[PDB]
Amino acid sequence: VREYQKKRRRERIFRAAMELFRNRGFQETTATEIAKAAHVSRGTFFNYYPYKEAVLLDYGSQLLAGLREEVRRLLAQGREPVEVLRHLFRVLAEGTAREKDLLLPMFYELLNPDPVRARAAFEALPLGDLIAEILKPLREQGVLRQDFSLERMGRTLADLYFLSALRWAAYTPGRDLAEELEKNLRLLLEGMLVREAPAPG
Amino acid sequence: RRRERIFRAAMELFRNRGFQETTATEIAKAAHVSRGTFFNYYPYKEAVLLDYGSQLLAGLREEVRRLLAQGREPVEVLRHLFRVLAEGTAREKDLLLPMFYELLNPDPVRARAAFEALPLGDLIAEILKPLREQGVLRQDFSLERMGRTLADLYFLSALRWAAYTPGRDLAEELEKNLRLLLEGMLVREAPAPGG
Ligand SMILES: CCCCCCCCCCCC(=O)SCCNC(=O)CCNC(=O)[C@H](O)C(C)(C)COP(=O)(O)OP(=O)(O)OC[C@H]1O[C@@H](n2cnc3c(N)ncnc32)[C@H](O)[C@@H]1OP(=O)(O)O
Numbered sequence: 009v010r011e012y013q014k015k016r017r018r019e020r021i022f023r024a025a026m027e028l029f030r031n032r033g034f035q036e037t038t039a040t041e042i043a044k045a046a047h048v049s050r051g052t053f054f055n056y057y058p059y060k061e062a063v064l065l066d067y068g069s070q071l072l073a074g075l076r077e078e079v080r081r082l083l084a085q086g087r088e089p090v091e092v093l094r095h096l097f098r099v100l101a102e103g104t105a106r107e108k109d110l111l112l113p114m115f116y117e118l119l120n121p122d123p124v125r126a127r128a129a130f131e132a133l134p135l136g137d138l139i140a141e142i143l144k145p146l147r148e149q150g151v152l153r154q155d156f157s158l159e160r161m162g163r164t165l166a167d168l169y170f171l172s173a174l175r176w177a178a179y180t181p182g183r184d185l186a187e188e189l190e191k192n193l194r195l196l197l198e199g200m201l202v203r204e205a206p207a208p209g
Numbered sequence: 210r211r212r213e214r215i216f217r218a219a220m221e222l223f224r225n226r227g228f229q230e231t232t233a234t235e236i237a238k239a240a241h242v243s244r245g246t247f248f249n250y251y252p253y254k255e256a257v258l259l260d261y262g263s264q265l266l267a268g269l270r271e272e273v274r275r276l277l278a279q280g281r282e283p284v285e286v287l288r289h290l291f292r293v294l295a296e297g298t299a300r301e302k303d304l305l306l307p308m309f310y311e312l313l314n315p316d317p318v319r320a321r322a323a324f325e326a327l328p329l330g331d332l333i334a335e336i337l338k339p340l341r342e343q344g345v346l347r348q349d350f351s352l353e354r355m356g357r358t359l360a361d362l363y364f365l366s367a368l369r370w371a372a373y374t375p376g377r378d379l380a381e382e383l384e385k386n387l388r389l390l391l392e393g394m395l396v397r398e399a400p401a402p403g404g
């Protein structure tokens with residue numbers, strides 16, 4: 009019964025932290041406030057979350073798992089990969105705009121000077137690999153280059169999302185994030201060089 | 210002179226003791242000016258790195274424009290530019306890393322000063338001009354915007370390389386960015402290409 013109590017405890021702390029973060033702000037909330045609200049010692053909080061940002065990483069990982077489930081659903085339903093890609097970025101744009109205040113500090117964590125944490129943030133938010141899954145069918149379909157691995161390409165697109173999202177959130181919140189993300193997709197997918205227009209129907 | 214004596218004294222201290230460990234006070238003393246005078250020239254320490262970054266960029270800009278005269282093909286100029294950036298980044302990683310972090314400083318006023326000091330995107334956009342002229346680049350995006358996007362990729366790759374994974378061949382990584390963005394991930398196999 010310890011495992012169940014342990015999972016119950018982590019989940020409660022998470023909820024407590026998220027409620028406080030949403031109502032008072034991430035930076036303004038302290039481990040002491042979180043512990044109090046979750047009904048646990050501060051020491052217990054740190055045992056589950058050694059540093060506050062780890063709560064946000066937990067959150068982003070949850071958001072990503074929901075998107076993954078969505079993408080896999082659309083692909084199994086037979087949606088064209090390119091459309092799923094365009095769908096994913098549209099949903100990423102919407103979710104990022106909606107959760108801007110919590111995602112911003114989480115975004116900086118990927119740029120943490122301490123390599124151990126930058127690494128932990130990275131592994132917790134594998135958007136790059138989700139994108140790779142969508143590219144996979146395109147490759148077997150023969151329309152995708154093969155001089156670069158699916159992994160490195162997906163990672164490149166995920167890096168663009170990250171930079172555009174961070175910049176939008178930190179510096180230009182008034183701009184159209186959906187359009188900006190569509191641009192990254194269109195450029196990396198089709199390239200800057202013009203392509204052949206099909207014979208009209 | 211002075212702005213020059215300060216900048217040189219700063220770089221020398223950075224070289225001998227490290228950027229992070231060097232202080233405004235020490236720079237002031239080595240440049241022979243008061244802390245007040247130092248700050249008129251460089252309100253904050255990273256501003257010295259921006260100045261450094263600007264001069265390195267000017268040099269690249271120099272090289273670029275002089276290769277375009279010489280008739281070198283646009284795409285070949287781009288490949289050269291990134292081969293030079295790759296080596297340069299590797300050689301001066303210790304000073305460039307704190308400069309890269311400054312580009313994403315939370316203070317919008319500082320992030321903008323950093324962006325404006327390091328206009329790589331615009332340089333890429335000048336090299337692209339002949340392609341635009343040839344009529345071979347899409348028109349739903351400006352050259353400036355496409356250029357900014359390829360510079361962003363450089364930034365991303367370079368910051369990752371210099372801070373977390375120096376093991377990667379930086380030149381091949383930049384060559385990858387150029388290739389994906391210029392050509393796209395979808396293949397180009399038309400039996401009858403234009404031109
Ligand atoms: C060895 C060392 C080598 C060099 C080492 C260094 C290499 C650095 C590589 C790059 C690294 C980075 O950039 S990372 C930097 C992250 N930092 C930031 O983003 C800080 C941002 N700070 C700022 O102050 C912002 O940039 C502002 C406030 C100036 C706003 O930007 P901005 O308005 O886009 O600036 P500007 O230069 O005029 O850009 C004009 C383009 O944006 C478009 N644009 C603007 N608003 C809109 C809009 N609402 N809808 C559509 N389009 C818009 C314009 O139409 C035009 O696109 P179009 O019509 O032409 O298509």
Ligand SMILES: CCCCCCCCCCCC(=O)SCCNC(=O)CCNC(=O)[C@H](O)C(C)(C)COP(=O)(O)OP(=O)(O)OC[C@H]1O[C@@H](n2cnc3c(N)ncnc32)[C@H](O)[C@@H]1OP(=O)(O)O
Binds near residue numbers: 128130135376
């Ligand atoms: C809802 C909001 C969501 C939000 C979601 C937001 C997602 C944002 C994602 C991007 C965010 C950023 O990273 S922005 C950039 C700055 N931040 C960061 O980079 C985050 C921290 N970064 C890191 O820790 C590192 O860069 C890693 C972990 C990403 C690097 O991965 P790594 O394996 O160490 O390094 P990698 O590049 O893979 O190199 C492996 C070497 O071995 C080869 N190799 C090949 N296969 C393998 C293999 N299976 N295992 C190991 N190695 C392999 C590779 O070719 C390479 O050779 P060779 O290369 O020697 O030839």
